[PDB]
Design a protein around this ligand. Structure first.
Ligand code: MG
Ligand code: MG
Ligand code: MG
Ligand code: MG
Ligand code: MG
Ligand code: MG
Ligand code: MG
Ligand code: MG
Ligand code: MG
Ligand code: MG
Ligand code: MG
Ligand code: MG
Ligand code: MG
Ligand code: MG
Ligand code: MG
Ligand code: MG
Ligand code: MG
Ligand code: MG
Ligand code: MG
Ligand code: MG
Ligand code: MG
Ligand code: MG
Ligand code: MG
Ligand code: MG
Ligand code: MG
Ligand code: MG
Ligand code: MG
Ligand code: MG
Ligand code: MG
Ligand code: MG
Ligand code: MG
Ligand code: MG
Ligand code: MG
Ligand code: MG
Ligand code: MG
Ligand code: MG
Ligand code: MG
Ligand code: MG
Ligand code: MG
Ligand code: MG
Ligand code: MG
Ligand code: MG
Ligand code: MG
Ligand code: MG
Ligand code: MG
Ligand code: MG
Ligand code: MG
Ligand code: MG
Ligand code: MG
Ligand code: MG
Ligand code: MG
Ligand code: MG
Ligand code: MG
Ligand code: MG
Ligand code: MG
Ligand code: MG
Ligand code: MG
Ligand code: MG
Ligand code: MG
Ligand code: MG
Ligand code: MG
Ligand code: MG
Ligand code: MG
Ligand code: MG
Ligand code: MG
Ligand code: MG
Ligand code: MG
Ligand code: MG
Ligand code: MG
Ligand code: MG
Ligand code: MG
Ligand code: MG
Ligand code: MG
Ligand code: MG
Ligand code: MG
Ligand code: MG
Ligand code: MG
Ligand code: MG
Ligand code: MG
Ligand code: MG
Ligand code: MG
Ligand code: MG
Ligand code: MG
Ligand code: MG
Ligand code: MG
Ligand code: MG
Ligand code: MG
Ligand code: MG
Ligand code: MG
Ligand code: MG
Ligand code: MG
Ligand code: MG
Ligand code: MG
Ligand code: MG
Ligand code: MG
Ligand code: MG
Ligand code: MG
Ligand code: MG
Ligand code: MG
Ligand code: MG
Ligand code: MG
Ligand code: MG
Ligand code: MG
Ligand code: MG
Ligand code: MG
Ligand code: MG
Ligand code: MG
Ligand code: MG
Ligand code: MG
Ligand code: MG
Ligand code: MG
Ligand code: MG
Ligand code: MG
Ligand code: MG
Ligand code: MG
Ligand code: MG
Ligand code: MG
Ligand code: MG
Ligand code: MG
Ligand code: MG
Ligand code: MG
Ligand code: MG
Ligand code: MG
Ligand code: MG
Ligand code: MG
Ligand code: MG
Ligand code: MG
Ligand code: MG
Ligand code: MG
Ligand code: MG
Ligand code: MG
Ligand code: MG
Ligand code: MG
Ligand code: MG
Ligand code: MG
Ligand code: MG
Ligand code: MG
Ligand code: MG
Ligand code: MG
Ligand code: MG
Ligand code: MG
Ligand code: MG
Ligand code: MG
Ligand code: MG
Lengths: 200, 143, 64, 115
RNA sequence: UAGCGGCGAGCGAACGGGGAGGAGCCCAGAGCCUGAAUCAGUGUGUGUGUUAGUGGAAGCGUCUGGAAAGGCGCGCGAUACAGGGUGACAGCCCCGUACACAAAAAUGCACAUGCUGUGAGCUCGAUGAGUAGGGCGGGACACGUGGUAUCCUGUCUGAAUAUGGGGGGACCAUCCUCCAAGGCUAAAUACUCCUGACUGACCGAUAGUGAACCAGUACCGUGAGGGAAAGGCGAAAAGAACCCCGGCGAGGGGAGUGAAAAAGAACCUGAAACCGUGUACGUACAAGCAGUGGGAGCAUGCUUAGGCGUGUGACUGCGUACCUUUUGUAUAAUGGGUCAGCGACUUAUAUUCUGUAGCAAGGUUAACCGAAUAGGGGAGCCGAAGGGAAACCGAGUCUUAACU
């Protein structure tokens, strides 16, 4: 069960979803993988091939009292080479469905212990305005939050862009890193019901 | 847990062998590949199954057999995955929808893998002498 | 890219249930009249690959 | 991520050049030469911790042999005379007594004379 | 994988399946009837989009400082806390930003539709000859002439032509399947000299383009062609009026600006090599990798009324540099004039093994639909069964006539 702060209604949520042992390694791996997915990795140096110049030997092999050289472009020279030049690469890494679900089940269950998960009934601002949302969180005693909702209101969305420490994401689009990052998590009764069914 | 507080399980990560980095690294100067020779060099080493010019094992032995085309289009149905189709009818097209065997497999055979419960009438399918005892002992009549 | 099997090896070896490889014996193609029957009989069945040269087979054909 | 390494190297050279402070010529000024001298200084330092113990023993033994022969006994018979009288006093002290308190030392030789 | 292959090195399919995207028609021509589907223009309709743009919210007081955006304390706008500038770090000083509005004129689009101009329904009969195939020689097919189907042809030949011909991998015969010897067809696909916007676990002047700078310049070459080096005063030039020395010089010293001028243009920071000036000790009877353990004196500090630290190092025991390559190097074997910067086990996909996490006789998705790191999609793959060359049999099976 999960009590509310303006009703005290017994929302009987599943045991294994919101009440399991916090597996650290899984969560760590999934959040690290999620971070690694965020990278675009758009970078490139140029190999001795790719550098502009000639392939001609600056001086002949023998005869001259100098270190044998083949090109201007060689990485031991100045102004051309970079031995192992990088290529635009994809750092995103695979995560198993059961591991991603297991990690969400692991982190979302730990918020019930730490009391960061503030489950609520209907949560929605009157008109599309930040001023009201900023004021109404002072009564709720919140600052840095992830307001999860089932029915995503444009009124509520538009009202929480400009606020830095608030973020409004849909119950469908919850993430591993976000649930960990934010200092509290305000879930709607519908959103809990959706996420329960989604994670299963 | 916060974003900093997390950590991996002890044993997960293992750094990586960084060659050519001083004496203290152990490996460093000739990074774990000895002094001179073909193997030490960049792009070094020989190709697969090369025994220094001696006639390799994969050539000094005679080649045998031929690959059967009929063996490609036959399956070995394990009797454990028998009652997973449509009650108790397992011809071929029915079995194929259950994803037990591949699409291009006309011939097929049921072997004694163990465990049957429901009565399954195994029609239009070759069946083994041990499986014929089991399948009937469960209840279902073959053919 | 994927590893290419050393085809010549793929036709001379077959992977048994445990992991070892069966192979046909040499010295049973030609020049057989001078050979005694006891050799030719012993060379006829297939035989297992030795421990020493197992790594040379395993590398040549990584798939099966 | 490119790692420019001008900061760390200089610190490593500077650390060693500080250890070479006092030496003649490029051995103090020039890392490539200093680093050899600082290592060899370590090799000699490691060695001479063993030799310090040897040299001082010889140095004491010379003083004891000098102070004993004044009283009429050679070092060989003196130490045997002390060992036969079961005296546990070492060379370090015997040499120190031999220099400082000779009126004291005399009695040790007279004790060695008995045995 | 099946194959191909001095059956070596290597090369490497299709069938079938899951997806993206889907669309078809004209000719080798004769009736009635004919502008009606169709497009290809001159166009007409809004909607635009675009190349100029407009508005666009709400802060004050003290403290430190050269300077406030800073601290400190109280406000207020937020569909605007993207970002930039401003004398240090600005939601509210400025330019922007979100949001609502814009085009006289040229244009790129998607639908009405007047139209020089183009052909609908339906009869009866046509169905691409030096061609298909063949011999010879080459080539393309994963397929190297091999038992080699298939296609293309240089060369020499030669059918039937729909009661016909092609194909089904030598070939034949039955079945099935298509209809060559003429054409036109969007989308999914590849690319970015170029124009915008936006983003980086990209670089920050030996890096990043060769080129942050009047660089494809200087310079080199007959020429094709090669090809550099070189960034930063300060918030603001307030870039030093004026004296003094000097050659109505270079260069300095004062004065003056400024928070600061060892920030004064050879201009932030200013290392090291290298070259000096002055202070302390040692140093002109003393042999050698120049150090190292011992150690007198002398010179400097501290607190005490006695001991330490630091610099120096007379004299003295031991002591032949580093790297490389080697059986072995003080070696008179290699390499290094020194310093600073840069300079070498990497990246991608496959594979086996170790560790670790998930789930477990199961595990698991790939491309793709996705506003998208969810969730679909199990097409597949791998495992749970192997023996046999193979048919085939299967907790057995191979061998063999058969197995104690
Ligand atoms: Mg050339
Ligand atoms: Mg040379
Ligand atoms: Mg030279
Ligand atoms: Mg380089
Ligand atoms: Mg350059
Ligand atoms: Mg470069
Ligand atoms: Mg990787
Ligand atoms: Mg925070
Ligand atoms: Mg915004
Ligand atoms: Mg569950
Ligand atoms: Mg599910
Ligand atoms: Mg640890
Ligand atoms: Mg790596
Ligand atoms: Mg070692
Ligand atoms: Mg090794
Ligand atoms: Mg070497
Ligand atoms: Mg050797
Ligand atoms: Mg070697
Ligand atoms: Mg090479
Ligand atoms: Mg190689
Ligand atoms: Mg399947
Ligand atoms: Mg034998
Ligand atoms: Mg046999
Ligand atoms: Mg072994
Ligand atoms: Mg197999
Ligand atoms: Mg297999
Ligand atoms: Mg950097
Ligand atoms: Mg000294
Ligand atoms: Mg010292
Ligand atoms: Mg020098
Ligand atoms: Mg110095
Ligand atoms: Mg030694
Ligand atoms: Mg000793
Ligand atoms: Mg051969
Ligand atoms: Mg075929
Ligand atoms: Mg075919
Ligand atoms: Mg197909
Ligand atoms: Mg369409
Ligand atoms: Mg269409
Ligand atoms: Mg307009
Ligand atoms: Mg404004
Ligand atoms: Mg102020
Ligand atoms: Mg402060
Ligand atoms: Mg405050
Ligand atoms: Mg923006
Ligand atoms: Mg900003
Ligand atoms: Mg700003
Ligand atoms: Mg910028
Ligand atoms: Mg400042
Ligand atoms: Mg700030
Ligand atoms: Mg601030
Ligand atoms: Mg403020
Ligand atoms: Mg107009
Ligand atoms: Mg208009
Ligand atoms: Mg007008
Ligand atoms: Mg025009
Ligand atoms: Mg035709
Ligand atoms: Mg043909
Ligand atoms: Mg013919
Ligand atoms: Mg033919
Ligand atoms: Mg002929
Ligand atoms: Mg031909
Ligand atoms: Mg072609
Ligand atoms: Mg060829
Ligand atoms: Mg052949
Ligand atoms: Mg032809
Ligand atoms: Mg014919
Ligand atoms: Mg004719
Ligand atoms: Mg027809
Ligand atoms: Mg007809
Ligand atoms: Mg007929
Ligand atoms: Mg044919
Ligand atoms: Mg056939
Ligand atoms: Mg046709
Ligand atoms: Mg035709
Ligand atoms: Mg046609
Ligand atoms: Mg043709
Ligand atoms: Mg088109
Ligand atoms: Mg289309
Ligand atoms: Mg714009
Ligand atoms: Mg970044
Ligand atoms: Mg930087
Ligand atoms: Mg440059
Ligand atoms: Mg610089
Ligand atoms: Mg460019
Ligand atoms: Mg120019
Ligand atoms: Mg000239
Ligand atoms: Mg010229
Ligand atoms: Mg002046
Ligand atoms: Mg004057
Ligand atoms: Mg004058
Ligand atoms: Mg003059
Ligand atoms: Mg001047
Ligand atoms: Mg002047
Ligand atoms: Mg002045
Ligand atoms: Mg004056
Ligand atoms: Mg004055
Ligand atoms: Mg002043
Ligand atoms: Mg002042
Ligand atoms: Mg100053
Ligand atoms: Mg200052
Ligand atoms: Mg001044
Ligand atoms: Mg001044
Ligand atoms: Mg000063
Ligand atoms: Mg001054
Ligand atoms: Mg500055
Ligand atoms: Mg300066
Ligand atoms: Mg300086
Ligand atoms: Mg200096
Ligand atoms: Mg002096
Ligand atoms: Mg003096
Ligand atoms: Mg003197
Ligand atoms: Mg003399
Ligand atoms: Mg002297
Ligand atoms: Mg001399
Ligand atoms: Mg000597
Ligand atoms: Mg010396
Ligand atoms: Mg010393
Ligand atoms: Mg000492
Ligand atoms: Mg001393
Ligand atoms: Mg000393
Ligand atoms: Mg003194
Ligand atoms: Mg004093
Ligand atoms: Mg000496
Ligand atoms: Mg010596
Ligand atoms: Mg060498
Ligand atoms: Mg050796
Ligand atoms: Mg040698
Ligand atoms: Mg030696
Ligand atoms: Mg030498
Ligand atoms: Mg040599
Ligand atoms: Mg060397
Ligand atoms: Mg060098
Ligand atoms: Mg040299
Ligand atoms: Mg490696
Ligand atoms: Mg576990
Ligand atoms: Mg478990
Ligand atoms: Mg299951
Ligand atoms: Mg799909
Ligand atoms: Mg697969
Ligand atoms: Mg499979
Ligand atoms: Mg099998
Ligand atoms: Mg019989
Ligand atoms: Mg029998």
């Amino acid at each position: 069960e999960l009590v509310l702060k303006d009703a005290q209604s017994a929302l009987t949520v599943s045991e294994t979803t919101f009440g399991r042992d916090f597996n650290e390694a899984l969560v760590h791996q999934v959040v690290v993988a999620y971070a690694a997915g965020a990278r675009q990795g758009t970078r490139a140096q140029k190999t001795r091939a790719e550098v502009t110049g000639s392939g001609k030997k600056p001086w002949r092999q023998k005869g001259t009292g100098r270190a044998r050289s083949g090109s201007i472009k060689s990485p031991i020279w100045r102004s051309g080479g970079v031995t192992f030049a990088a290529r635009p690469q994809d750092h995103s890494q695979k995560v198993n469905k059961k591991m991603y679900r297991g990690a969400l089940k692991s982190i979302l269950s730990e918020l019930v212990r730490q009391d960061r998960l503030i489950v609520v009934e209907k949560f929605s601002v009157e008109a599309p305005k930040t001023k009201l949302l900023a004021q109404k969180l002072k009564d709720m005693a919140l600052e840095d939050v992830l307001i999860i909702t089932g029915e995503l209101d444009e009124n509520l969305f538009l009202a929480a862009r400009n606020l830095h420490k608030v973020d409004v994401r849909d119950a469908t689009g919850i993430d591993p890193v976000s649930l960990i990052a934010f200092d509290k998590v305000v879930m709607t009764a519908d959103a809990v019901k959706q996420v329960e069914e989604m994670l299963a | 847990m916060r974003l900093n507080t997390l950590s991996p399980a002890e044993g997960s990560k293992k750094a990586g062998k960084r060659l050519g980095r001083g004496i203290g690294s152990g490996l460093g100067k000739t990074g774990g590949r000895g002094h001179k020779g073909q193997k030490s060099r960049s792009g070094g080493g020989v190709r697969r199954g090369f025994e220094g010019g001696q006639m390799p094992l994969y050539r000094r032995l005679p080649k045998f057999g031929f690959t059967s085309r009929k063996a490609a289009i036959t399956a070995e149905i394990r009797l454990s995955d028998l009652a997973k189709v449509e009650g108790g009818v397992v011809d071929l097209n029915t079995l194929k929808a259950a994803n037990i065997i591949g699409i291009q497999i006309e011939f097929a055979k049921v072997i004694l893998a163990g465990e049957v419960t429901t009565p399954v009438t195994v029609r239009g399918l070759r069946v083994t002498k041990g499986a014929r005892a089991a399948i009937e002992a469960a209840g279902g009549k073959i053919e | 890219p994927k590893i290419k099997t050393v085809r010549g090896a793929a036709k001379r070896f077959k992977k048994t249930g445990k992991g070892g490889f069966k192979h046909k014996h040499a010295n049973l193609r030609h020049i057989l009249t001078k050979k005694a029957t006891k050799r030719k009989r012993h060379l006829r069945p297939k035989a297992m690959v030795s421990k020493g040269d197992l790594g040379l087979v395993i590398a040549c054909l990584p798939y099966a | 991520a490119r790692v420019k390494r001008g900061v760390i190297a200089r610190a490593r050279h500077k650390k060693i050049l500080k250890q070479a402070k006092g030496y003649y010529g490029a051995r103090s000024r020039v890392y490539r030469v200093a680093f050899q001298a600082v290592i060899k200084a370590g090799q000699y330092a490691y060695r001479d911790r063993r030799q310090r113990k040897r040299q001082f023993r010889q140095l004491w033994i010379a003083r004891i042999n000098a102070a004993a022969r004044q009283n009429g006994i050679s070092y060989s018979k003196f130490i045997n005379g002390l060992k036969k009288a079961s005296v546990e006093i070492d060379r370090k002290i015997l040499a120190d007594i031999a220099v400082f308190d000779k009126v004291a030392f005399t009695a040790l030789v007279e004790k060695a004379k008995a045995a």
